[PDB]
């Protein structure tokens, strides 16, 4: 008896979305938009596909999901009416039905993928980047479509037709898609080098990250990006500095001058470090092998400033980075241990074993943290391999824990993988320590297998 006009509602919600994402994003506007959108409903009206992907895009932006009726009436009519969706509307629909957990939000994606594969040849520069960035989110696994889109990217970029902002989008989307191709990334790097100085630092760093995260085994590009990063180190903030640290570590080559100027940059930005990317700027150093202690002390000093709000994985990464050449600053170490005890929330099994192992190998034993981690160990021991089970067992032994409810599950697991438990030479010494504590009485089958 009173149906809101869907088209005008869409034109209103577009303005509301622009206001919400440009003015700062006060929740009052979000609530107003959700109120108006909930009562909106597609009905015996005849909305065109251009003004249906808007009622879906804005809705999904504002928090709507398959729970609402608007979404359930907009995700449908995309299953039944697919001809209406042209290559301009496709990216919006595909990037809308990506966070949605419904089972039509995954038939729609596949039905669109069956259309973009055939039309992956007839696409200009902008639409290819839009479609690739749309399909990156959904995590689809259609290799023919990706091959065709890479072909189109190479054909379009043979003659310079990508601005120095679509290269970042395309590289990020393919890297997140985990698609290893030497031709496509070589072409993208060539095009990026063609547009000299148009790739500013804010557009340079993500390109380095995307290329480093793909696993391209090659010394070519990692050599070329070095001078660009060296020149651009002047005008970049802490976040990009740490991210580039991690990217250069993952490329796997050692550059003296670039790392030196990176350290000279970091020592000037030590104040801003918020410890969420101190983990990366430490783990990159650990991984590459560089062991320069000039900035380790400053990072240690800044770790005191933010210790109360280290993320869970951050503690694991930082402490395992404090394993190699750990300077044993117990002043920070004790508080880190106390926080790790207090942050004993949902963790990572690998995180738990690495945390305990790094705590034990540094020989700065503490009680409350050991108790908490040993308590948590039971729920994750069923998902550990032989090596990590051995590390966890040795960490427990160095913690001097004799609780049967804690040790029975790990012993059962290590018996289940005895052949792999014994066949790792690098842990053999560790073996001669674990049974050093528990004695032959504990788990007689394990001792019998150990003697042979």
């Amino acid at each position: 008896v009173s149906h809101l006009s869907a088209r005008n509602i869409a034109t209103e919600a577009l303005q509301m979305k622009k206001l919400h994402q440009e003015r700062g994003g006060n929740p009052m506007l979000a609530q107003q938009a959700r109120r108006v959108l909930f009562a909106t409903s597609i009905a015996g009206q005849n909305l065109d596909a251009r003004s249906v992907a808007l009622l879906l895009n804005t809705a999904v932006y504002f928090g709507m999901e398959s729970d609402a009726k608007l979404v359930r009436e907009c995700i449908d009519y995309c299953l039944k009416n697919d001809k209406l969706i042209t290559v301009d509307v496709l990216p919006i629909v595909v990037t809308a039905c990506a966070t949605l957990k419904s089972r039509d939000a995954r038939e729609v994606i596949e039905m669109q993928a069956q259309k973009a594969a055939r039309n992956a040849k007839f696409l200009d520069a902008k639409d290819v980047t839009n479609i690739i960035s749309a399909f990156s989110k959904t995590g689809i696994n259609h290799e023919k479509l990706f091959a065709f889109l890479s072909r189109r990217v190479q054909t379009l970029a043979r003659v310079g037709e990508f601005e120095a902002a679509h290269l970042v989008i395309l590289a990020n989307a393919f890297s997140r898609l985990r698609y290893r191709d030497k031709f496509l990334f070589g072409a993208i790097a060539r095009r990026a080098m063609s547009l000299r100085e148009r790739v500013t630092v804010n557009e340079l760093v993500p390109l380095i990250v995307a290329f480093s995260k793909i696993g391209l085994k090659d010394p070519k590009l990692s050599k070329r990006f070095a001078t660009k990063a060296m020149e651009y180190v002047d005008q970049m903030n802490a976040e990009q500095v740490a991210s580039m640290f991690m990217a250069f570590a993952y490329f796997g080559i050692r550059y003296d001058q670039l790392f030196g100027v990176l350290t000279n940059r970091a020592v000037e930005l030590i104040d801003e470090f918020n410890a969420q990317y101190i983990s990366t700027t430490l783990n990159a150093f650990q991984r590459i092998g560089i062991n320069n202690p000039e900035l380790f002390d400053n990072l240690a000093e800044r770790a005191l400033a933010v210790v109360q709000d280290h993320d869970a994985r951050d503690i694991s990464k930082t402490v395992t980075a404090l394993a190699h050449f750990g300077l044993k600053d117990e002043e920070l170490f004790k508080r880190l241990a106390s926080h790790a005890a207090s942050i004993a929330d949902q963790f990572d099994a690998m995180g738990l074993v690495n945390t305990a192992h790094a705590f034990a190998r540094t020989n700065f034993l503490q009680q409350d943290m050991a108790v908490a981690l040993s308590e948590r160990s039971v729920y994750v021991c069923r998902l550990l391999d032989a090596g990590e089970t051995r590390r966890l067992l040795w960490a427990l032994a160095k913690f001097q824990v004799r609780d049967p409810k804690i040790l029975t599950p790990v012993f059962n697991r290590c018996l289940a993988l005895h052949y792999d438990f014994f066949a790792d030479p690098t842990g053999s010494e560790e073996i001669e320590e674990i049974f050093d504590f528990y004695g032959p009485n504990f788990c007689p089958p394990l001792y019998q297998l150990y003697i042979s």
Binding site: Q21, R35, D104, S243
Partner: protein, 357 residues
């Protein structure tokens, strides 16, 4: 003023508008208790309290519940380097088809029927269902007959000749590999290898099965040359004198199912059709892969009447293993043969082949 005021209630209001449904004492209590306000002015009327509460909540949100659909290209994300419980998903309810089967997993809950007439109450209903972890053998058998129905209809609608062959061999799963995740991975990447290996010592055993099922030798030990050429795969079956007998198009599998048993060689079922070849190109060679195959074939007629052919083959590529297979041509749409019982018999014979090697 009372305990029915809760942060959940004063949030479900704020998100709904309608914040003026709470009287002055309610909002004063909310500001005093939850908002840690020093002391609300008793003189304050409804509107000032509503404004203060809304401001406090707006500052309290301190997060973003909006998932952006845009693609900001200045986002440096170094962090990156299913059971359907939390809701009721709305709108629910080159291998072309591969589903994994196993003899232990059976991740499909079974359903039974029981009459709780003796239970308290309920003494009017004589049928009710329940839940049970169904046996993998029978569940996979039912899924197999359903899949064979599907793959038979899919080739009936194309009116294309085809057949089902069952190879006895192992499967090696790569390190890159619940069961549905495995099914999706194998249907997406194919990170597996199939090795058709048979021991020679079992030959005397297999002849015994020929007497067990009363199978007659339809083809003696015959040496043929299976040669696939590129032009497209073209498979020619040369005789012992290098003369082509039959040229065929590539095996286009439609239904694939690798039964990975715990022990003994696995069973690889393959429903596949050979695309008919235009004679204009077939006549050319009648007058990259190359194998010599010494083949022995036993034949029988099953209880349902389909031709059953047990084929042993000594394969040896030249451009080398024993292999055992079952062969049953795909029934046409004019035969009206039973499907379920025939499928059960074929599954049992496949089990016999697996257990006899």
């Amino acid at each position: 003023d009372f305990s029915h005021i809760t942060r959940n209630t004063v949030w479900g209001l704020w998100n709904e508008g309608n914040l003026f449904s709470l009287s002055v004492p309610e909002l004063a209590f909310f500001l005093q208790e939850h908002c840690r306000v020093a002391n609300v002015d008793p003189r304050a009327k409804k509107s000032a309290l509503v404004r203060q509460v809304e401001e406090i909540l707006s500052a309290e949100q301190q997060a973003s519940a909006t998932v952006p659909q845009e693609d900001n290209p200045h986002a440096i994300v170094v962090t990156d380097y299913e059971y359907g419980d939390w809701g009721a998903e709305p709108g629910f309810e080159s291998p072309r088809a591969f589903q994994l089967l196993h003899s232990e997993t059976a991740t499909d809950v079974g359903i039974a029927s029981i009459d709780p007439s003796k239970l308290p109450g309920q003494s009017k209903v004589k049928n009710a269902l329940a839940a049970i972890h169904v046996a993998p053998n029978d569940a996979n058998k039912m899924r197999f007959r359903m899949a064979f129905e599907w793959c038979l209809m899919n080739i009936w609608n194309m009116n294309m000749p085809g057949e089902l062959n069952i190879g006895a061999g192992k499967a090696l799963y790569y390190r890159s590999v619940p069961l549905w995740t495995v099914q999706k991975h194998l249907y997406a990447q194919h990170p597996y290898a199939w090795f058709a290996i048979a021991s020679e010592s079992n030959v005397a055993a297999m002849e015994s099965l020929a007497a067990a099922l009363n199978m007659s030798i339809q083809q003696e030990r015959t040496t043929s040359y299976k040669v696939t050429i590129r032009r497209e795969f073209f498979d020619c079956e040369l005789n012992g004198q290098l003369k082509c007998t039959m040229m065929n198009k590539p095996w286009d599998r439609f239904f694939v199912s690798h039964y990975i048993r715990s022990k003994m060689p696995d069973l690889r079922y393959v429903v596949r059709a050979r695309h008919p070849i235009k004679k204009r190109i077939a006549d050319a060679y009648l007058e990259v892969y190359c194998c010599e195959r010494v083949v022995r074939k036993w034949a029988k007629k099953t209880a349902t009447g389909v031709t059953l052919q047990l084929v042993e083959t000594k394969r040896t590529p030249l451009i080398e293993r024993l292999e055992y297979e079952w062969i049953v041509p795909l029934p046409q749409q004019a035969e009206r043969i039973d499907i379920a019982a025939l499928t059960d018999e074929l599954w049992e014979y496949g089990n016999k082949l697996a257990a006899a090697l």
